[PDB]
Amino acid sequence: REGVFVSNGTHWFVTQRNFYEPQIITTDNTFVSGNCDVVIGIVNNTVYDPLQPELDS
Amino acid sequence: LQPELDS
Amino acid sequence: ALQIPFAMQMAYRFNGIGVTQNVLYENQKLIANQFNSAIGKIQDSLSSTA
Ligand SMILES: *[C@@H]1O[C@H](CO)[C@@H](O)[C@H](O)[C@H]1NC(C)=O
Ligand SMILES: *[C@@H]1O[C@H](CO)[C@@H](O)[C@H](O)[C@H]1NC(C)=O
């Protein structure tokens, strides 16, 4: 949404681009647009859902 | 949220 | 100088003019071709007259 995706090789995070501060990737940190075919150089991993704890209510 | 609150 | 991939530098330059950055990545080959064609026309433009 604003920031950059980065990884310590094992895990994927998003950060603000002018100071390293890792955030867990979530559907409020990010926005959807279309499908994995068109983006050159995309990667997989999970995106976590902030509603999931109350999906488990 | 409303389709998720269908749970 | 902090290295960054050139497609991501353009994504953050689009994000600087009120265009959501997915508009770049969904069009990257077309945007690269528009730039490559446009910079080609500069050589002919400069060649045409002093
Ligand atoms: C990045 O660079 C190397 C060498 O050009 C290439 O093998 C690799 O596929 C490239 N990846 C992307 C996402 O362009
Ligand atoms: C992501 O995973 C799918 C299978 O779920 C696979 O087909 C695809 O090639 C993977 N993409 C990348 C960029 O690794």
Per the CB < 8 A criterion, the answer to whether A47 and A30 are in contact is: yes
- Which is nearest to C20 in space by CA: A1, B4, A54? A1
Beta-carbon contacts of residue C21 (< 8 Å; ≥ 6 apart): C11, C12, C14, C15
- Is the minimum CB–CB distance between B4 and chain A shorter than 8 Å? yes
Instruction: Please tell me the distance between residue A40's alpha carbon and the centre of ligand 1 in angstroms.
Output: 10
What letter represents residue A41's amino acid? G
| CA angle centred on C27, ends C9 and A12, rounded to 5° | 50
Please name the residue whose Cα sits nearest to atom 8 of ligand 1. A41
Nearest alpha carbon to residue A25 among A47, A56, A49: A47
Place of tokens 């689009």: C14
Q: Tell if the CB–CB gap between A40 and C8 is shorter than 8 Å.
A: no
C25 contacts in chain A (CB < 8 Å)? 38-40
The closest residue, in CA terms, to atom 10 on ligand 1 is A41
| Residues forming a β-bridge with A14 | A5, A23
- Closest-CA residue of A relative to C4 is A4
Encode burial over C13-47: b for 16+ CB neighbours within 10 A, e otherwise: ebeeeeeebbebbeebeebeeeeeeeeeeeeeeee
Residues 6+ apart with CB under 8 A from A45: A12, A25
